[PDB]
A paper describes a structure:
The type I-D operon contains the type I signature gene cas3 split into its two domains; the helicase domain (Cas3′) encoded from a stand-alone gene, and the HD nuclease domain (Cas3″), which is fused to the large subunit as part of the core effector complex. The [name] subunit is bigger than other type I large subunits (Cas8) and similar to type III large subunits, yet retains the type I functionality of discerning PAMs in target DNA sequences. As is typical for Cascade complexes, a repeating, helical backbone of [name] subunits assembles around the [name], while the C-terminus of [name] and two [name] subunits constitute a minor filament along the belly of the complex.
To investigate [name] binding and single-stranded vs double-stranded target discrimination by type I-D Cascade, we bound type I-D to a [name] containing a protospacer that matched the [name] spacer and performed cryo-electron microscopy. Our efforts resulted in a structure of the [name]-bound complex at 3.1 Å resolution. Overall, the structure is strikingly similar to the double-stranded target-bound complex. However, in the single-stranded target-bound complex, we lose recognizable density for the PAM recognition domain, likely due to the flexibility of this subunit in the presence of a single-stranded nucleic acid. Our structural studies revealed a flexible PRD in the [name]-bound complex, which suggests that the type I-D Cascade does not require PRD engagement with a specific protospacer flanking sequence for [name] binding. We observed no binding to a non-specific control [name] that lacked complementarity to the [name]. Single-stranded target-bound Cascade has a flexible PRD (PRD disengaged). Based on this structural analysis, there is no indication that AcrID1 binding to type I-D Cascade would affect single-stranded nucleic acid binding, consistent with SIRV3 being a dsDNA virus.
Author numbering:
A (entry chain K), E (entry chain J): 1 to 146
B (entry chain D), C (entry chain C), D (entry chain B): 1 to 320
F (entry chain E): 111 to 220
The structure:
RNA sequence: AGGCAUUGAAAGCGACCACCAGGGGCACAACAA
């Protein structure tokens, strides 16, 4: 299974560990995909004339800044546990950074060939996969006991 | 110039050809962001960058086979209809459906560019193309643009729901150059002025004609020969080779390099070459053909004659 | 160069062949999107990848048998007509209908590439040929392109209803190589220059010649011999094994690899070889054959002699 | 190797048989679309698939009775004319007309492959041959291709009148194998080298030799015996059983398996076996025979000697 | 097991379970075979190095995000007012995932041997049989309801 | 019928009116600036109720006196069709993004 | 010059068309001695 099933799963399980709209609000596509949309936008909005490791550190700070605009019920890694500010902030930063490692070094770098042209013609489909996978997971996590 | 060339052509279209090729060698420079697509992405192919040096792989855009003959062809049919030599009304005796059972068998379009379905058989084109390739790499010759289609209210909502008319589309950039050869088999002098007229007078190519795809066809040479010369890909590879892999240079310089490469390549082809029109002879030839197409009396005389030449072909050798 | 080779050919066509084969070993490189088809799909067949090391099964394209002789003949016949040796007019004393009852029985095409219908009998081709196979696998060497045909109104629904003018077709990619060995059995020196002429001078192959399927024939050797050498499939498989299956290499490197495998295959054939023309001797041979085909007085002297030789064959041994 | 084999043979042809069979065990691999027909369809027959285990019926292609001896015979006659031992011009003392009176009745073809037309009697072929069967079933081993013949103007209509030239023909696929034993009775050592020469030097078999039917003959064994070994069908059914029908194996693994099934069968035949040339002794013997057929002095000496032997036979026991 | 053949009626009934148009509306071929056209487009369009299980979530998301681009008149699950909307969606997303897995394994993987060239040459033929099978099933429902 | 349409079962019709993309006569560096824009809470400050709501970014806008030479075309028209099309060219003025605030232009027919 | 603050929601295509004609043997050889 691994070589793309784990890639296409972990692409959303790694943002579900730090970002969750609860589905009963009937939220937008734009609200669910908020991490992947700003990750793929950050990857397309600069050329490959500077490296993937520069792209992770600049991008992770940008994604952590966009989630500083989100309401706290959307960040499960702050909402769902009661522990000290500097430690809940460190795990939230390492979940954001590790999500950005897969997104650059597997999704862009291997699955999209490392090439902006094949990623750009594919954004609507990798978004619709991640959209479907988020609901397939979230509604399973909610309803599997029924 | 053309007063000498009348001798090179046939006096009427022949039953089978006789090795009287004329080749038009041109650079097609992009303006106004063309789209050459087939399956919803711009057409590209992996190729060798040059011939002798620069052997490394390069993906380049392709103006796929038909997308360069049918813009030429339709601009010809329109002129035949302006001059009243063919018609669009279903009550007229000289009607010509473009694509159908309903086709004429006898107009300059049908005998030069060919026809296929019907009971009256079929006719192979006398004007020959092939797919033409960007001189540059695809990465440095395209950009994708978002488009949206909102409601007239200046918004993407009409009942407070979103309209979902958003997508992005891949466009070729301006100053991208496709080197091309079209070739013509056993035409008459008036048929040469018809197809050359089309190369010069048609400007819009590929998808979405009403909004993009205006091109500057610079004719680089016209070569009369005993057979067919180099492919489009071989001319692009030779021209990238001679341009040193630094294609980012002026349009006139690229045209003079193409005149110089075309003559270098022609010397290596196993074909007799009766006339080679390059440089000042081409700039003078083009100006007197440009004069034919600007004078209503000469153009109506010359294309009226082609009509007869093709009605004669049709009634003597064609679909009767 | 050619001044030495006249010694190896027959002085006139013989009644039955006495084992004087000339073989043309060549790589046919695609330049622009050929369509090699029967039954509405690209012809493709399963084969072993290479002779000894790469022993996996591999689907490869097949340039089926006639699709690489017919362009040779039809380019030759057109030259016989340019030179005025044969003619197309139904009244003329030197008429040759192709592939029909009214075929000539005495011109160079008829004796070298053969004929069969009508009372005067048949003649087997002195040119021997084979189906050729793509060097690479079918999955990396083809692409499917959709095509449509709108009404001239620039729509698919000018009649108020959709045209049904939309379908797709499979085309072979550029830089795809088909190795082939043509053969010529018991020719004259002038017959050799005619057949070598076609191989070097013809450019178009497969379906849709008027739009597509330009190719670049690189002759890699000529071998004078006492018999038939390896099959196309064996050369294709030997060259794949020699390339180790990593076929993404420049065309010029593929041609020197083709020459250096072909000589090693020739060393394993139970055939006496009188003149293996490869490399620098082939470059000066082909540059000398070019300066026949580029010169009006030389070509018309040479092919006229072929006409007489072939006429003589026809009236002494052939169809009378 | 051949220096020891010289002992096994007789010194000159006898008038009655004396045992002394040499059996050439082959696999014939198709390389390029053979046609093996009589009566307008591929010859095919229902047979048990294999001897002991896989005892179900199966239809296999038949390389019918002459199709595997006329190619051999005619390629040897061409060699006799290249070496100058026979000629094809009328008014020569060494004429040999094929299938008439005026067949030589003295040359190696006339003695080894036989004659029967006209006065002066008839001669039984000392080469004994058989119909061969495809190792695989007909359904996995053939395809139908369509053939057109358009008019030279490039289309299937000539005046709007259609051209009635579209049929289809069935062709045997590449890499399909035909197991065989061809057998030689009472040869001299040079006669063995001639017949073996024909088997290695021939390359074309079916209908339409001019375009198709290249094959690769792998000689897998040579067996010296007092009389005929197993049938062609029997070797095929034994080989099919040894694989269980898993026939999609590379040609080397298939030739190495055929050598082992052939040795198993030879041990069940009531025949004294003087010499069994297989494996490393065979690919030495094949190399020593390639060294003859690539050398003009050795080959002219060796087949000139046969000529004398066959002419001696003609005047002492045959037609003179 | 038998699933190497005889697919086509189940392939259409499995989308007829979540998307419909009546032949009394005199619909286009494009409106009849809409779900299969999105499924086959997704299989053929995305890069050929991706294998089965990533295609299903993408192709299902391409079809859920495309039926919500149309009128509830066409959705005989979301149109059932008898059920609470999150449980309509639990039925909808399991119908699409069950159809679209039959399009990625049974159609593309088994019936077309997993080869995009085999699928491409016979796409129009597959589609045609689904248009006729849809009409054949539409002519069954009026029989069982009368 | 003049500018065209495509969605529906009734057909489609191609535009009779033809355009290119237009290009600035002068270079980009001489013909644009990027301008900061901010969106405070209407109490008049970036403090929303004790903590800043972030709404400041910059956007790039073309200067006045920048010229885009263009050639429109119209085919197979009637005289009243020309009066409509020349009319629309003469009468409309709001081109770009943010019509409600910017992108008034004057088309000079030359 | 300070603190601050570099965005935000949504949308991610929609319709239709997936071919069209016409050809589907043509010539001869049926034994030779």
């Amino acid at each position: 299974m691994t070589e793309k099933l784990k890639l296409t799963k972990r692409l959303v399980e790694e943002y579900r560990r730090f970002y969750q709209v609860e589905l009963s609000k009937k939220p937008s596509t734009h609200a669910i995909l908020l991490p992947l949309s700003k990750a793929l936008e950050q990857i397309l909005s600069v050329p490959d004339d500077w490296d993937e490791e520069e792209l992770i550190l600049q991008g992770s700070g940008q994604l952590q800044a966009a989630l500083d605009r989100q309401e706290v019920y959307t960040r499960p890694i702050i909402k769902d546990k009661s522990v000290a500010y500097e430690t809940r902030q460190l795990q939230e930063l390492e979940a954001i950074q590790i999500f950005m490692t897969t997104c650059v070094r597997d999704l862009f770098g291997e699955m999209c060939k490392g090439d902006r042209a094949i990623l750009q013609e594919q954004r609507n489909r990798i978004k619709s996969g991640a959209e479907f996978a988020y609901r397939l997971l979230a509604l399973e996590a909610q309803q599997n006991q029924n | 110039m053309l007063d000498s060339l009348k001798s090179q052509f046939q006096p009427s279209f022949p039953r089978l050809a006789s090795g009287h090729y004329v080749h038009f060698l041109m650079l097609r420079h992009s303006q106004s962001f063309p789209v050459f697509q087939t399956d919803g992405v711009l057409n590209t192919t992996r190729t060798q960058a040059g011939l002798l040096e620069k052997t490394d792989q390069l993906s380049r855009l392709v103006m796929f086979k038909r997308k360069q003959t049918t813009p030429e062809r339709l601009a010809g049919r329109e002129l035949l209809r302006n001059l009243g030599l063919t018609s669009a009304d279903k009550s007229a005796k000289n009607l010509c459906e473009y694509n159908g059972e309903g086709s004429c068998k006898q107009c300059p379009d049908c005998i030069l560019y060919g026809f296929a379905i019907g009971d009256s058989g079929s006719e192979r084109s006398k004007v020959y193309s092939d797919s033409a390739f960007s001189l540059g790499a695809y990465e440095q010759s395209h950009r994708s643009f978002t488009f949206n289609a909102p409601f007239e209210g200046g918004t993407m909502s009409e009942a407070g729901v979103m309209r979902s008319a958003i997508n992005e589309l891949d466009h070729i950039l301006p100053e991208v150059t496709f080197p091309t050869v079209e070739s013509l088999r056993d035409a008459t002098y008036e048929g040469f002025i018809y197809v050359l007229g089309n190369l010069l007078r048609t400007k819009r190519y590929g998808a979405q004609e009403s909004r993009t795809g205006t091109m500057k066809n610079h004719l680089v040479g016209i070569v009369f020969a005993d057979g067919e010369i180099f492919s489009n890909l071989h001319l692009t590879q030779a021209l990238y080779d001679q341009m040193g892999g630094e294609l980012n240079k002026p349009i006139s310089e690229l045209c003079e390099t193409a005149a110089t490469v075309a003559q270098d390549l022609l010397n290596k082809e196993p074909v007799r070459k009766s006339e080679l029109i390059f440089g000042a002879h081409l700039d003078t030839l083009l100006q007197e053909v440009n004069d034919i197409y600007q004078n209503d009396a000469e153009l109506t005389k010359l294309l009226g004659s082609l009509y007869q030449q093709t009605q004669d072909y049709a009634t003597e050798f064609g679909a009767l």
